[model samples]
Target chain A: DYALAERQAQALLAHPATASGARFMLGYVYAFMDRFDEARASFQALQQQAQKSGDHTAEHRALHQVGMVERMAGNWDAARRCFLEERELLASLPEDPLAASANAYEVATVALHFGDLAGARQEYEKSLVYAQQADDQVAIACAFRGLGDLAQQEKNLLEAQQHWLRARDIFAELEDSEAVNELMTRLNGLEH
Target chain B: AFEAHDYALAERQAQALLAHPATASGARFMLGYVYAFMDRFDEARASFQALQQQAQKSGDHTAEHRALHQVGMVERMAGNWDAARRCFLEERELLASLPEDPLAASANAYEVATVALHFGDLAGARQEYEKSLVYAQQADDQVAIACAFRGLGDLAQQEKNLLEAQQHWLRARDIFAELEDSEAVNELMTRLNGLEH
Candidate 1:
């Protein structure tokens, strides 16, 4: 299976259109195979290519993937570096505000891993602020979700519930039935 | 099989793993793990006891501590509160006497907390979870840290401290998210969401 993925990636790399997608797939396969070093290298190379091509979105994606691979291998420092890099690059791309917010979320997650609770909370709030400013409804919902998570972490159930409800309301308003159902599932738990 | 929660397959693999001397203890641990989840407390206890004896002979305090911990888990699952408390307390003392294996110590502390919860000692549960948290922090073991926070949340929830419970669960959820333990994180989110309704 890995050989097939590798061959497919090699073929794709010969073509400009499918190159990035293939590179991402190859990285996924490498990570799946526990070849994390190679996976990081592939993602790093992909990020460089995307940057050179002025494709900020793809660059952000590759960096995000690199961070993911590092995280899976428990390389906290490397994961934080890559996630921060993604957050910075994505933030510069004004049109892709959601991606930027998502990158911030990843950085927050990394901070959480390192037991940096304050950093995690601060980054999540920043992400939420950016999401609200971007006017991307789903991103705004995600921001609330993250804030709810932070509140929950702080042992503030009322505030956490408020945040989750706010997110759920936004999804409901958007007529995102799937998200509404998911929120409902999330809500269907212990009384009190 | 563990991922799929296929205890039957887990049993088979564990049994196979037990056939080799080098892997026997680890395999026994897995067998106990699967048996506990399967609700086969008697068999789990037997496996753990056998392993515990071997660890005693080998002077493998770490192995013995883990076996004692598993025995405690079996007792807890079986609703043998007194037995669980005894085993967990012994395991805790044994862990303390050994050079700190943070992962093992943290895990033992979590089990002790669970037993305390079962015994209806809320304060004890809270105390054990904090002890678990200290070891987990030392190890930087995300899963164990999450477990400790989750345990604290559970204790808080049981005490009707929903605010405090949500705080711990949310903290646990974020750490689990970083570990990509989606199932755990999702459960925490669900519980948190329930607070609103």
Candidate 2:
């Protein structure tokens, strides 16, 4: 099925208007298929093409995909670098609170993977600020959840509890039963 | 503060924002959700009804549809299944009159499918879930697509089709894993394990 999808996307590359989109789809398919090198190459080419056309949005999206490929391949350092570059590019664009929040959160997640607790905390806070600016409930809750993870790692049970509780309440309101249940398990674990 | 479960503070803030014309609609929506979370079903319904009326009067179909969806959720939470079904059906009718939006269509169909599944209407659930998958694919919403697969898997399991259930669940699991949703992945693993047993 993915091979069929790949063939379709490959064929779409013949047309100028569909070239970029096709490449994007190809990158996604390759990434999902675990063809990391091909995925990276596809996204890298897309990034270059977007950059050449001064299309910041496209470039940003391509870079994000590249980062995703790297992350999926377990190239943590590369993933961190790509996300940082993506964040830098995002900073030069017009103020988009949602994008800012998402980028910061991605960077924070990568930093956390690297055990850079302080850096992760800072980025998570930055993500929270942008999420609040956007008034995006899901993003705000995610930021809180990230902060709770950091707090738990730091052995700050009280802080972790506070953050997770906030996240749980939001998730509860959103009817995300899975998230609420996960948070409940975490909260209960803290009791022991 | 709302995230912090400070309903009193959130309620006051939402009420204050209601006084401003520009913020009134959003405030009312927030108030409804806040009241719903607080288990004040009557108040939540009232707020959503007011919002729906205002949106209808102003010719804001999107807001009206959203209000209907929220009211449906409130009704479902309050154990008013028939009322919830009516609201969801009305919401779908409103959406049908508007421009094509695959995302909204996918979400609405998914909700309807769940309602059908709860009522033991397996055939209805399957039809709606399949519809949801089509719209989700059109919207390129991977999460929704995975959700549809999960729903189908549930339906298959209920129908005693273990193989079909496994296939559907595997597809859903792979998608959720790719999306880095550890909780979903873990839950799917549990389901898979249960199936094996």
Candidate 3:
């Protein structure tokens, strides 16, 4: 793995011409570092530039990133703001790959942040459409994981384990070692 | 890479064990364990209760002690609080008489924690968990240790402290797996999967 991720982001950010990819990549890095506030700033900047350029692709990406990072930072209000905008932007676009997944990811993250388990479940269901449309198995696996979480809350342990077991299999197939390990760790703990 | 050891396998294993004469008592106890897990307390109680009589007839003190402990669990799981207390009291008599028996300590710990979790006594839960830990360690029983961890995790989860809940689940899962107590491990896994909430 090249440590060139941030450097590439820097190069992309150097020109307004590439702000869409540049802003999102940097923001994503910030999220991985747990510096959610800075990530939110980058995403917010990306969203503004996207609006100016009428680039709904970049707009959806920025909104989802802002939603995810802000939620992680426990900024619920800000998270909702980003997710709502993300949903609107993605819905306005048609048949775009990022547009589809961004819809589900945005909705699920916001519902989870808002402490609405049922609503979160509902969002996962909608997100399923996007993942299926985009043929994005990883995000679809995430949707299952999120729904499993909801089942766990309902004391439906059997259903919860079933969903997680599915997620683990999918993540493993995708060669997502970390995601697979995480799901396996969870399923291993839950096996009766 | 995967084997179909689903809940059906659990039931199948318990039944197969019960069918063999040499493993009869262990099998019966496992059936009771499964019944309790499924929340079929009446079935669990009836079975565990009968095991006591069978043990007495066979002059099996260890099996008798275990059956009595399980009977207490059944009664508790059934929510017959006083009846559960009597069963535990019965276990205490047997345990006190044979203090060297390691399994007895686990039984006592089980009894103590039940009374705490039953009365919604969080403080009692905490104390009993600590006591349960000591006894579980003394008994060298990883299953009982996992039970103690589940007790702690359950309390934390009820309080919505997801971090503490996940930690406890991990701690308990380690012991449960070591004990080959798939039921316990699976139950904790379900909770840990939800601790994200």
For candidate 3, write residues A1-192 as lDDT tens digits: 011234435544655544444555566556544567777787788678768988676567556656667777877787788778766766677766535554555566667756787787877887766667767676678778878877877778898899998888887776556677877777787756
Q: Is candidate 2 or candidate 3 better by DockQ?
A: 2
Off by over 4 Å in 3: A1-4, A15-20, A95-98, B1-197
Q: Calculate the i-RMS of every candidate, to one decimal place.
A: 19.9, 15.8, 27.3
Q: Which residue pairs overlap in candidate 1's backbone?
A: A152-B167, A153-B171, A155-B167
Give the runs in model 2 whose Cα sits over 4 Å from its true position: A1-11, A29-35, B1-197
Judged by DockQ cut-offs, the docking class of candidate 2 is incorrect
User: On a 0 to 1 DockQ scale, where is model 3?
Assistant: 0.01
Please list all clashing residue pairs in model 2, or write none if there are none.
Answer: none
Q: What CA RMSD would you report for each candidate?
A: 17.6, 11.3, 22.6
Off by over 4 Å in 1: A1-192, B2-7, B16-26, B193-197
**Predicted complex 2: DockQ:** 0.03
Best by DockQ: 2
CA lDDT of each prediction against the hidden true structure:
0.71, 0.79, 0.66
Residue A77 miss distance in model 3 (angstroms)? 2.1
| lDDT winner between candidates 2 and 3 | 2
Please give the distance, in angstroms, between residue B99's alpha carbon in candidate 2 and its true position after superposition. 33
